[PDB]
Amino acid sequence: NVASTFLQAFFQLWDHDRLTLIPQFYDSETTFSVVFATDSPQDPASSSCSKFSRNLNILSPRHPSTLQRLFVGSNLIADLWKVLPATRHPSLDQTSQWLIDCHTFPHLADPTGMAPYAMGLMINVNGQCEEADISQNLYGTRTFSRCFILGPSKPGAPHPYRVLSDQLTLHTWKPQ
């Protein structure tokens, strides 16, 4: 199971050494997205994304009830990831915590040009984690859904597969 192998490594790194993930799996073609709500009072990630978008003037005003999405190109991924809260994810060994779906996506082009089509992998992850922001002194449990789109990597890549798209949706944050 490639998804389990990828997610086990991905989330362990995401907790302790996330920036390592970018050179390994991410490239110039990749896009990263975060969906969050402005309404939440004690949400650390929402404030982090909100401040980040404002600083780079990326933010576009919407109704408070309306959901907000922040998407960044390859150059901005590292800086955005830095700002996001520290997280501790439960091991995938605990089946109750994670719901993982892995599906083939045979619509991708072949970078080599050797074959007409290239095999693509789509990974959807439902999980929970412990989000802590020390500077704010905010601690809580997060509910999230994350979607990965995997395709064949470009030449000189560390790994055979790369992340074409990464979409993170922040649903609920429970204090203490």
Numbering used by the authors: 381 to 556
Structure paper excerpt:
The Mex67–Mtr2 complex (NXF1–NXT1 in metazoans and small bristles in Drosophila melanogastor) is the principal mRNA-export factor in Sacccharomyces cerevisiae. Mex67/NXF1 is a modular protein constructed from four domains: an RNA-recognition motif (RRM) domain, a leucine-rich repeat (LRR) domain, a nuclear transport factor 2-like (NTF2L) domain and an ubiquitin-associated (UBA) domain. Mtr2 is a ∼15–20 kDa protein that also has an NTF2-like fold and forms a tight heterodimeric complex with the Mex67 NTF2L domain.
An unexpected homodimeric form of ctMex67 was also observed in which the two copies of ctMex67NTF2L formed a dimer analogous to that in S. cerevisiae NTF2. Two copies of the LRR domain were also present in the asymmetric unit, but the LRR-NTF2L linker was disordered. However, the previously ordered pre-α1 loop that gave rise to the asymmetry in the NTF2L–Mtr2 region was now disordered, perhaps thereby allowing the symmetric homodimeric Mex67 to be generated. Moreover, ctMex67LRR-NTF2L appeared to form a homodimer in solution, and in size-exclusion chromatography coupled with multi-angle light scattering the protein migrated as a single peak with a molecular mass of 82 g mol−1, consistent with a dimer (each chain has a theoretical mass of 42 g mol−1). The homodimeric complex of NTF2L domains in the ctMex67LRR-NTF2L crystals was unanticipated because it had been thought that complex formation between Mex67 and Mtr2 was a prerequisite for efficient nuclear export of mRNA. Although SEC-MALS indicated that ctMex67LRR-NTF2L is homodimeric in solution, whether Mex67 is ever not complexed to Mtr2 in vivo is currently unclear and whether the configuration observed simply represents an inactive form of the Mex67–Mtr2 complex or whether homodimeric Mex67 has another role in the cell has yet to be established.
